[PDB]
Design a protein around this ligand. Structure first.
Ligand SMILES: COC1=C(OC)C(=O)C(C/C=C(\C)CC/C=C(\C)CC/C=C(\C)CC/C=C(\C)CC/C=C(\C)CC/C=C(\C)CC/C=C(\C)CCC=C(C)C)=C(C)C1=O
Ligand code: SF4
Ligand code: SF4
Lengths: 198, 146
């Protein structure tokens, strides 16, 4: 299943054009350049993922950019304060297509624990989000897991190959939810280690 | 009425003479206890009578006499634990006149406090196991109080 933007449609995908679109998607998913944007504590765990003990550079996603023009992925890692929300909107608008969004942490997801007068309740109030990470903060390996989820989402999407030839619509795969995918193994868990030991 | 020892046999059976000795004249129908009677068992029997003859109106008698009964049963069986005699002493203190609705519970706690005062060695002999109110729950480390 797919979602159309320019509507729920089917898969539009010649055998050379499909392979070369797959190569485009493979190159996009193996070359993701995140934007350097520090909001709150979630950014500290994000740059912890950038460091040597985790080495997110292995996935090719270490190239941190101070310019939104050269960044493909925006990781909203922190609280969306009301004064910072126009800044986040302007930085998102300054990015170029294709652009992806990962909300990191409960603040970016929904507002989290700050249902307060000066906090926007989630970055999806004004910016579309492709991957959400729960946690406060999510650990760096959770950020890496969200990165892999973003790569699976990117590798299954259909984008305009050129602005002069072909359909210019953007197709996003309506993937299965991770909750329903992992419900088979999560419910079967019986015994966990007791909290008294290490 | 409070227990009295052999040395108290010489004072006259009057209200103020027995009252100054730490007991009550009562009905003046005395009862003798020989050396073959365990004082813990005797006070257990007395408190079983008093706890089962509570009318149930007021909290200290109704809910404190059975606790003393259970403590005395544990002491008679040799299953007493530390703090039990302290609990009995506090029960005698808090079931006195004015604390309960009528005078049944002060009369109940007179023999217990007198026997603890005069025959404490028999009550301490019943304490033979450490205090244990909780069982261990797997996965929860207990708060180890000192
Ligand atoms: C927060 O610390 C930082 C990083 O994370 C470790 C970076 O990766 C970076 C990015 C720099 C690098 C990955 C090293 C330079 C090499 C880069 C960007 C490779 C780019 C290659 C091409 C465009 C060839 C196609 C910066 C600037 C940084 O400050
Ligand atoms: S979700 Fe928690 S850790 Fe992340 S920015 Fe909010 S308060 Fe900080
Ligand atoms: S002290 Fe008297 S009023 Fe209170 S429960 Fe006992 S018998 Fe009843």
């Amino acid at each position: 299943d797919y979602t159309l933007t320019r509507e729920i449609v089917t898969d539009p995908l010649n055998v050379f054009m499909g392979k070369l679109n797959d190569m485009v998607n493979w190159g996009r998913k193996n070359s993701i350049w995140p934007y350097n944007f520090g909001l709150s504590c979630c950014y500290v765990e994000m740059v912890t993922s950038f460091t040597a003990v985790h080495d997110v550079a292995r996935f090719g996603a270490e190239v941190l950019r101070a310019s939104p023009r050269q960044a493909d992925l925006m990781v909203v890692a922190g609280t969306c304060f009301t004064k910072m929300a126009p800044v986040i909107q302007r930085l998102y608008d300054q990015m170029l297509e294709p652009k992806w969004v990962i909300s990191m942490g409960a603040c970016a997801n929904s507002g989290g624990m700050y249902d307060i007068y000066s906090v926007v309740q989630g970055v999806d109030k004004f910016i579309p989000v492709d991957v959400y990470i729960p946690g406060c903060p999510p650990r760096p390996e959770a950020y890496m897991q969200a990165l892999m989820l973003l790569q699976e989402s990117i590798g299954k999407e259909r984008r305009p190959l050129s602005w002069v030839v072909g359909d210019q619509g953007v197709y996003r795969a309506n993937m299965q939810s991770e909750r329903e995918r992992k419900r088979g193994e999560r419910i079967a868990v019986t015994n966990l280690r007791t909290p008294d030991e290490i | 009425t409070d227990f009295l020892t052999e040395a108290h046999l010489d004072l006259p059976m009057e209200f103020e003479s027995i009252g100054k000795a730490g007991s009550r004249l009562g009905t003046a129908l005395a009862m003798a206890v020989d050396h073959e009677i365990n004082m813990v068992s005797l006070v257990r029997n007395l408190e079983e009578f008093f706890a089962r003859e509570s009318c149930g109106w007021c909290t200290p008698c109704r809910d404190g006499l059975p606790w003393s009964v259970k403590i005395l049963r544990a002491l008679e069986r040799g299953e007493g634990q530390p703090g039990d005699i302290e609990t009995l002493e506090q029960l005698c203190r808090f079931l006195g006149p004015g604390k309960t609705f009528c005078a049944h519970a002060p009369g109940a706690v007179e023999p217990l406090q007198s026997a603890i005062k005069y025959f404490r060695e028999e009550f301490e002999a019943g304490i033979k196991q450490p205090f244990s109110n909780t069982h261990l729950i797997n996965g929860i480390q207990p708060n180890l109080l000192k």
